[PDB]
């Protein structure tokens, strides 16, 4: 029922299996009446400092409207999954749909 | 640096009268200095054994006007040597007194309690904060390690108070005179005195908590119940005699 904004980055080596993650998460969100207002992939981006011996990562941004339960479920899967190295979910005042300045500049 | 000698004549009459030095007793007054405390010794003692750590004072101390040849002078630190050596030289326990810097006045009596019989009575003038603790008893805030250890050896009696304005560049503290004279017999003898010091130090290092854990580093509740010591009272409530009880037990057992 609230609006969120999930950004997570995944191991560069597994950059090919992201579609399954996106599809699974989309099914989970939409199953409980939640909507999706923006979904973006920035591709591989060079990291600004070495996150536990790596460089570069695959970046995903996704804007969601949904209730608390599905968000807690997504948090738990992120925590238990391994390919994800760093994720962050934020609450937002209202929905947005305009693409990030990041995508346009690229 | 500067020391602060005693000038007022009204105060130093009680001290002389209280010591009442007669003829035939060994007086060992350390640190004569300017002889401010031996000049009022003009009832004299036909002899005295003096100890002075400084050669300059000893040198310009051998003549005075009248002093000359009545006393033997030693130039070694009192804290170092054997007082008891100069005990069979005369044949009687020594009567001593002093006005030493409160700073160095603590270690000497604990260097003098060891030699025991070679010492009969003492009359020192110490700080008021310290004198109260020496004559103190249980269940107060002046009760401490110093009280227990000193009371285990000798008897402590205050003699005279010195109000601060008696000395030149007078300090911010008050001084006092106490009379201590070692016991003829020990009410509670302990095999090893060092173990007694160990127990008292450990107990009074956590003075503010119960002995179930203040002193539980060595004992156990049922043991202390055996000797009739309440395991829920602070260290300041334990009487000297009780403190000698576990002193005996810790050597009797393991």
């Amino acid at each position: 029922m609230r609006h969120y904004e999930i950004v997570f980055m995944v191991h560069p080596d597994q950059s090919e299996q992201v579609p399954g993650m996106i599809e699974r998460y989309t099914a989970a969100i939409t199953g409980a009446e939640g909507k999706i207002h923006r979904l973006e992939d920035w591709g591989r981006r060079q990291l600004a400092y070495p996150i536990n011996k790596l460089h570069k990562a695959h970046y995903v941004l996704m804007n969601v409207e949904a209730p608390q339960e599905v968000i807690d479920e997504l948090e738990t899967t992120f925590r238990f999954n391994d390919a994800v190295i760093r994720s962050m979910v934020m609450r937002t005042k209202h929905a947005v749909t305009e693409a990030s300045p990041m995508v346009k500049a690229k | 640096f500067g020391q602060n000698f005693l000038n007022d004549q009204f105060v130093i009459d009680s001290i002389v009268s209280a010591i009442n030095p007669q003829k035939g007793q060994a007086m060992v007054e350390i640190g004569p200095g300017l002889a401010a405390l031996t000049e009022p010794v003009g009832e004299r003692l036909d002899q005295l054994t003096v100890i002075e750590l400084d050669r300059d004072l000893a040198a310009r101390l051998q003549t005075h006007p009248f002093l000359g040849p009545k006393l033997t002078i030693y130039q070694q630190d009192a804290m170092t040597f054997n007082f008891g050596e100069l005990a069979e030289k005369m044949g009687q326990p020594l009567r001593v007194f002093g006005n030493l810097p409160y700073n160095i006045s603590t270690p000497l009596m604990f260097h003098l309690f060891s030699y025991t019989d070679a010492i009969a009575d003492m009359h020192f003038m110490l700080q008021k904060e310290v004198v109260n603790r020496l004559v103190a008893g249980p269940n107060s805030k002046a009760y401490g390690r110093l009280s227990v250890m000193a009371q285990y050896y000798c008897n402590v009696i205050p003699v005279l108070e010195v109000p601060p304005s008696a000395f030149t560049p007078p300090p911010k503290v008050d001084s006092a005179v106490v009379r201590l004279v070692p016991h003829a017999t020990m009410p509670h003898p302990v095999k090893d005195v060092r173990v007694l010091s160990r127990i008292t130090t450990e107990a009074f290092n956590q003075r503010r908590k119960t002995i179930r854990n203040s002193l539980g580093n060595l004992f156990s509740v049922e043991v202390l119940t055996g000797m009739g010591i309440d395991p829920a009272m602070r260290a300041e409530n334990i009487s000297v005699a009780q403190y000698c009880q576990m002193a005996n037990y810790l050597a009797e057992n393991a």
Partner: protein, 61 residues
């Protein structure tokens, strides 16, 4: 300027690079002459971007 007439996005590295020093610290508002409200938004955005490794914490290499 820094005070965009809406809010300050934390996904705009090009703008956020204007308000950090060579070492990656935040520039005080005396030097830039920016309003206090938008300065608070700046600090929050910079901290968030630091978490996501889009900016350096300091200068390790």
């Amino acid at each position: 300027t820094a005070e965009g007439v809406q809010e300050i996005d934390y996904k705009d590295i090009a703008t956020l690079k204007n308000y950090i020093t060579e070492s990656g610290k935040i520039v005080p508002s005396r030097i830039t002459g920016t309003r206090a409200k938008y300065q608070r938004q700046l600090a929050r955005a910079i901290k968030r971007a630091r978490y996501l490794s889009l900016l350096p914490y300091t200068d390790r290499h």
